[PDB]
Amino acid sequence: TKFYTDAVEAVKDIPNGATVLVGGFGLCGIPENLIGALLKTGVKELTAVSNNAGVDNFGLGLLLQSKQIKRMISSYVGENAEFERQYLAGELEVELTPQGTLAERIRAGGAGVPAFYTSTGYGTLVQEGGSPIKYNKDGSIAIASKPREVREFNGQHFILEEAIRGDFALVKAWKADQAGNVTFRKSARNFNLPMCKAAETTVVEVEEIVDIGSFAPEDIHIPKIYVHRLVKGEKYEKRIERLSVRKEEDDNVRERIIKRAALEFEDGMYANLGIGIPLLASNFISPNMTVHLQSENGILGLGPYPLQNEVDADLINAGKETVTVLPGASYFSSDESFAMIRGGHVNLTMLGAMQVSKYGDLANWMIPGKLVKGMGGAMDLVSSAKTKVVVTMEHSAKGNAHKIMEKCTLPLTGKQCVNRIITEKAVFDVDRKKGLTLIELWEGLTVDDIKKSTGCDFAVSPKLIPMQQVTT
Amino acid sequence: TKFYTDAVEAVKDIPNGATVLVGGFGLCGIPENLIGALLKTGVKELTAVSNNAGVDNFGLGLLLQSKQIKRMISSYVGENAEFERQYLAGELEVELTPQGTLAERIRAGGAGVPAFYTSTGYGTLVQEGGSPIKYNKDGSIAIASKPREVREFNGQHFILEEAIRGDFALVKAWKADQAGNVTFRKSARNFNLPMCKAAETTVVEVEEIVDIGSFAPEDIHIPKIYVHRLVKGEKYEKRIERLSVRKEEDGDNVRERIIKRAALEFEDGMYANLGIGIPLLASNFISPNMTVHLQSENGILGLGPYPLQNEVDADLINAGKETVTVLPGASYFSSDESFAMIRGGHVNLTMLGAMQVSKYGDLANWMIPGKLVKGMGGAMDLVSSAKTKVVVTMEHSAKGNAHKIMEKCTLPLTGKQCVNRIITEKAVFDVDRKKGLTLIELWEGLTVDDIKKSTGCDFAVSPKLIPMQQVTT
């Protein structure tokens, strides 16, 4: 490992048009010093593979303000006006890539694997092609993503994804011993670890340089062999995107859904809760019951929002909110996180949606010409059969428009992957083959009421009960 | 995580004919209590995917003595007489699998990846099929391995390997907190970590159960979510296969020459992987003012010298299964990581022995039909990346001056066009995938003609040919 004193000196040779890997989830664990060094360097036309676009005024956003980037390969690009700005206006090429696939591809880039099969994205724009890579001053598409090959294994369909590896990697880490061994703190690991292995030249910036022997050999997250260039960051502003604190002393259609979704929790289960209703549902989990919450950005065992003195920029949930962690929790890289999810190790995946098909098709990541912020990890989260996925959403849309239907209108997140639907009016069990059946009806409504608020037809369970709730 | 008091109670429901993953490298980090439980259970006709066959009287060997296994999926099956007797007799089916692909396949099994591409094995029996899975008395092949699909990416050839995942996994670990979080000690990790994620039901036996909060969250090796059943081992005999100690006060001629010349391949700050024998002995001559980092396939970076009497530890051994030491700033990692590292070409130099080397770099060092069938270990992965310089160290010729270097190898290949340099006691050849060999060093006393009649292929003579170098200093 070659040590540097100056960040610029370390990235000084990145060529224009180079493919650069940039670690960090949101603003957590981002290489702010190395990114600042690229501003001075002025290198341009970069194809930056990064999970997110940071924020307007910080993180990868800075390189966007300076127009130093031509290609973005990310999973979620929200909360960045200058970005979606450049994206929509056709000033930037973007390859919306499912988070899980992004992590695996990068790992493949460093493990000698040119390509691999994954079910994430099948039956989606990712697999079929047509995803907008570059617009041209119009909703019209200048450059559309291309189809991924499809092959089936053991009766399921998978698509071929090729390894990603850059010329350089800008990873952020916590500590480094004088030999070059690197470790990461809390959820700041995410993409930094895998990216540290998939680039010709790896550049790591650490908060502290400790001497050899400080780390237990079994506990080195990234062995020195992967750290080509190291430098201690000069300035760390611990920028926090969303501050969510709680005090130690704490509508209707939504209250109903939340209280019903809360009943999906079982003792000892592992669940991944999407932003909003599903996450709020966890608040009603019986204190005598214990559920383990997994966070896509690399966490297992997330707790409540932090108290004033618990806020830590290195610990946030998938929604970019400052979080806490319960005892016996654990941290892991993004490739790990998605190996876990993709492998169906999570018991329950609850998330919102805009439309659900009769047989389980899901749509919750894109509204053509109005919502193109990326799919995040949604496509991976519903990619396995060994994982029960239930969507929590209002029964019908603005003006009583069907949300549940024969076929979705909006681009899919995945085919036949929803197992259960929970609205404020009903609860449907959904099956890939026989369709959806009603198993719970809200007190006051009738099968007819549901009949005229559901785009398609459905069976009625002979054991149909009034929809349940749980304030206790 | 469900905790058990009895090992038997934990593996009680493994069905006959089940596919069971069994952790451990050699006798390091093997689940001896769970294996003992299967002896009592008596479950039979198992397909055991394990890196090795342990030894005759211990490890997976025990399950072989009791004939409880019908299929072995391993990378190296040596040091087990009962094993080969069964294999040669045709009573045991074996799928010799390259160590690196064995690790990747298992990880794929737990990460939702049905299949992936790797260059390990291309141009080999693994890729073209024909590897002996099951013999019949007379010595022929009853069941031969089948070909892996070939596809090229960015100008290189790769083969398709499918994920491996069992019904059960018997992994050995160091500690577990009361929540179920597991950690591994030294090189005892190897296959235990990845296997703990690729089975319907995972059973982990630990040396000790600590309470929650004992582990730093970012340092938990296997999160509780993967540990289905946990039990504390009742008996651990820290069995050591090969004791190698050194005293704090310390080959022939043709062997000394090669070693002293191979020692000159070391450069300051490089990362190297040294095969057993000459390449490893060469490391002994590394200038003390020079620092080289030694990689160990079983999951180690920064190997040191053999341990002193009070340093011997069954959890720390090299690829050759010898008890080893570790230098400061060293690190430990799983077998899948170890091979991601190797396969990704992160190691600078790979030195290993060989039986035959082709004119363009083909290598043969894992199988002699009907005389040496112990598996390729990690040899096929170690020479699979273009980025890693691979040099073979071997005696120039065989008995009766039979050629070792030639146009095409006779013995089954370890890899095609992968050797970059050959070092014998007579010469040093630089080898190129296209332009063949190039003599660059000649030993004092021999002539190009001498080399001409001890080499089976043409070779160019470098205009800067120097007398072969040595280094006692």
UniProtKB/Swiss-Prot annotation, chain B:
Catalytic activity entry: a 3-oxo acid + succinyl-CoA = a 3-oxoacyl-CoA + succinate; acetoacetate + succinyl-CoA = acetoacetyl-CoA + succinate
E.C. code: 2.8.3.5
Subcellular location: Mitochondrion
Residues forming the catalytic site: 297 (5-glutamyl coenzyme a thioester intermediate)
Residue positions, PTM N6-succinyllysine: 146, 371, 374, 408
Residues with the Phosphoserine modification: 131
Alphabetical UniProt keywords: Lipid metabolism, Mitochondrion, Phosphoprotein, Transferase, Transit peptide
InterPro entries from the UniProt entry: 3-oxoacid_CoA-transf_A, 3-oxoacid_CoA-transf_B, 3-oxoacid_CoA-transferase, CoA_trans_fam_I, CoA_transf_AS, CoA_transf_BS, NagB/RpiA_transferase-like
Pathway where it operates: Ketone metabolism; succinyl-CoA degradation; acetoacetyl-CoA from succinyl-CoA: step 1/1
Gene Ontology terms: biological process: ketone body catabolic process; ketone body metabolic process
GO molecular function, one term: protein homodimerization activity
One GO CC annotation: mitochondrion
UniProt main location, coarse: mitochondrion
A Pfam entry, by short name: CoA_trans
Broad EC category: transferase
NCBIfam families in the record: pcaI_scoA_fam, pcaJ_scoB_fam
Subunit structure: Homodimer. Only one subunit is competent to transfer the CoA moiety to the acceptor carboxylate (3-oxo acid).
Protein role: Key enzyme for ketone body catabolism. Catalyzes the first, rate-limiting step of ketone body utilization in extrahepatic tissues, by transferring coenzyme A (CoA) from a donor thiolester species (succinyl-CoA) to an acceptor carboxylate (acetoacetate), and produces acetoacetyl-CoA. Acetoacetyl-CoA is further metabolized by acetoacetyl-CoA thiolase into two acetyl-CoA molecules which enter the citric acid cycle for energy production.
PANTHER family listed in its UniProt record: KETOACID-COENZYME A TRANSFERASE, SUCCINYL-COA:3-KETOACID COENZYME A TRANSFERASE 1, MITOCHONDRIAL
Protein family per UniProt: Belongs to the 3-oxoacid CoA-transferase family.
Protein name in UniProt: Succinyl-CoA:3-ketoacid coenzyme A transferase 1, mitochondrial
Species in which this protein is naturally found: Sus scrofa
Classification of source organism: Eukaryota, Metazoa, Chordata, Craniata, Vertebrata
Gene name linked to the record: OXCT1
